[PDB]
């Protein structure tokens, strides 16, 4: 379960984004080819050198997120596809973030940000036309954690490459709702560390019980958002049997002495067919059961 915290390619995703230095550097592009106006940010000061260009996102509330994943979708043009400019041209860009308990507004200070990684392209764009008709879209993803503050900024630094940013998707992972072992487990946040495996408590479904001497149901949430290593289980209580992940009353003519995994048993020999959802079957008239004998026993005739 991926819960998205900010999506650039979406309505108003460009929102409150900022460029530094003021003026040139990163710039907001518009593409109106489809009836939908689409947006991107690009920079191509590959001839100039001494390039330090910053694009900061809006301030995004992290909410319950401990670890955030950042999904970037970009194109890089070739440095030598530009007549004689490689002397100052680069083909990577740098991904920065900053944690912040307040929205700083239009304030930006490079020094407050922390380098997550160099972002580099898997496929380069080589075109002979100044305006490249066909693009090679790259997809890269990084993670940071744990987050400690109310929100955070993302910023992108260009060192002199020819980059276009089409999509910035940042999300956190969660373990979904689950029915397992006749217990309902609630939607749980994931952990930030790989060794982190918290325990989450199962709620026996209607007409299910944790056995008198047995482990209560635990599940563990992982970093990917997949549950792991079930501990214990609930059981369909007496008079009920497991049907899918619910507990159903025994059919008339069946019984179940106690909570177990097994289905209801047919009423034993020399008994009266039981009503719906019974624990034991009554002895047929004129027959009896030995008092030491459990109700699963057949009844014998009264001597």
């Amino acid at each position: 379960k991926e819960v998205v915290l900010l999506d650039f390619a979406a309505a108003g995703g460009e929102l409150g984004w900022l460029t530094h230095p003021y003026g040139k550097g990163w710039d907001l592009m518009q593409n109106i080819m489809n009836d939908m106006p689409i947006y991107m940010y690009s920079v191509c000061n590959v001839m100039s050198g001494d390039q330090d260009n910053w694009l900061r996102t809006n301030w995004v509330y992290r909410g319950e997120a401990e670890r955030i994943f950042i999904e970037l979708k970009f194109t890089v043009r070739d440095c030598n596809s530009f007549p004689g400019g490689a002397s100052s041209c680069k083909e990577t860009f740098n991904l920065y973030y900053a944690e912040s308990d307040l929205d700083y507004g239009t304030n930006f200070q490079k020094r407050l940000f922390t380098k997550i990684d160099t972002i580099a392209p898997d496929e380069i764009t080589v075109s002979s036309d100044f305006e490249a008709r066909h693009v090679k879209l790259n997809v890269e993803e990084r993670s940071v954690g744990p987050l400690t503050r109310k929100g955070f900024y993302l910023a992108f630094q260009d060192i002199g490459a020819c980059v276009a940013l089409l999509s910035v998707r940042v999300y956190y992972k969660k373990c979904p709702e689950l029915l397992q072992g006749l217990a309902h487990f609630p939607e749980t946040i994931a952990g930030s560390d790989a060794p982190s495996l918290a325990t989450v408590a199962g709620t026996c479904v209607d007409h299910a019980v944790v056995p008198p001497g047995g482990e209560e149901p635990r599940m563990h949430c992982a970093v990917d958002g997949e549950w792991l290593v079930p501990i214990g289980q609930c059981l369909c209580q007496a008079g009920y049997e497991k049907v899918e992940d619910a507990c159903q009353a025994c059919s008339p003519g069946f019984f179940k002495f106690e909570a177990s995994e097994s289905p209801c048993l047919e009423c034993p020999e020399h008994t009266l067919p039981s009503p719906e959802g019974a624990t034991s079957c009554e002895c047929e008239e004129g027959f009896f059961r030995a008092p030491q004998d459990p109700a699963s026993m057949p009844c014998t005739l009264v001597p």
């Epitope: 518009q30 593409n31 007549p83 305006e131």
Partner: antibody, heavy 129, light 106 residues
Framework: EVQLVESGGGLVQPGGSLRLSCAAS????????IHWVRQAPGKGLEWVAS????????SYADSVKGRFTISADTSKNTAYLQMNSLRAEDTAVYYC??????????????????????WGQGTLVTVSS | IQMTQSPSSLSASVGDRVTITCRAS??????VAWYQQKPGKAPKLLIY???SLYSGVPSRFSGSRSGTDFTLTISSLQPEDFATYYC????????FGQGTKVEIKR
């Protein structure tokens, strides 16, 4: 005030050469495309050539490729069109114009694109004996 | 690509609504530009990015897109609006339309 000024036009014999000049002021060429568009008398606007002085890219209309070379000189903030092998069909008013360039086809700067927003006044080239 | 203008020329009275259409041969970028050219003078930009009114241009001019069909509109034709109008591909070949000559009927 942004300004583009053509000169170099005039009367030239068939097969001759003429070099046009587009003197820009009020802005620096490096930030934009510099175009040449031509209008044969009684005819429509024909785009002909373009240059980005920052990137050094050049492109031409087919009617012109191989015979005309557009260039630029960042120092004088001026663009030129060298025309060779002129024919009667090249008789036209030659305008120059600017536009914001884009490295990505189909994309425009939200704040800086305004198509061919500023033009020169034109210089007449007449190819005749 | 090619860019076809319709009609080739037209006549209208003052205060008439005039509509000029530009049709793109193939699928191009939708950043069609519109220009007004007085005989002997440089073209003047009217509309850029198919619908944006260029600074200074009177609001009677407007640009619209309906698929492959780009239209320039003059809501209230003024005597000073006599000119030739050109749509233009606002992308790589920058190709110009065939033009439409507009004369004022009186």
């Amino acid at each position: 005030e942004v300004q583009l000024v053509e000169s170099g036009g005039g009367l030239v014999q068939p097969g001759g050469s003429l070099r046009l000049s587009c003197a820009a002021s009020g802005f620096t060429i490096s930030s934009s495309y510099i175009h040449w568009v031509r209008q044969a008398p009684g005819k429509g606007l024909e785009w002909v050539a373009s240059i980005s002085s920052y990137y050094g890219s050049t492109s031409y209309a087919d009617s012109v490729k191989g015979r005309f070379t557009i260039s630029a000189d960042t120092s004088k903030n001026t663009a030129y069109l060298q025309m060779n092998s002129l024919r009667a069909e090249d008789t036209a008013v030659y305008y120059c114009a600017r536009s914001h360039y884009s490295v990505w086809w189909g994309w425009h700067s939200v704040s800086y694109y305004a198509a061919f927003d500023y033009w020169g006044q034109g210089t007449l080239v007449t190819v005749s004996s | 690509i090619q860019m076809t203008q319709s009609p080739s020329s037209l006549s209208a009275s003052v205060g008439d609504r005039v509509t000029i259409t530009c049709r793109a041969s193939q699928s191009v970028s939708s950043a069609v530009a519109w220009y007004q050219q007085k005989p002997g003078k440089a073209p003047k930009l009217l509309i850029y990015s198919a619908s944006s009114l260029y600074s200074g241009v009177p609001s009677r001019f407007s640009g619209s897109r309906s698929g492959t069909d780009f239209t320039l509109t003059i809501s209230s034709l003024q005597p000073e609006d006599f000119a030739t109008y050109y749509c233009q591909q606002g992308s790589a070949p920058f190709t110009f339309g065939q033009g439409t000559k507009v004369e004022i009927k009186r």
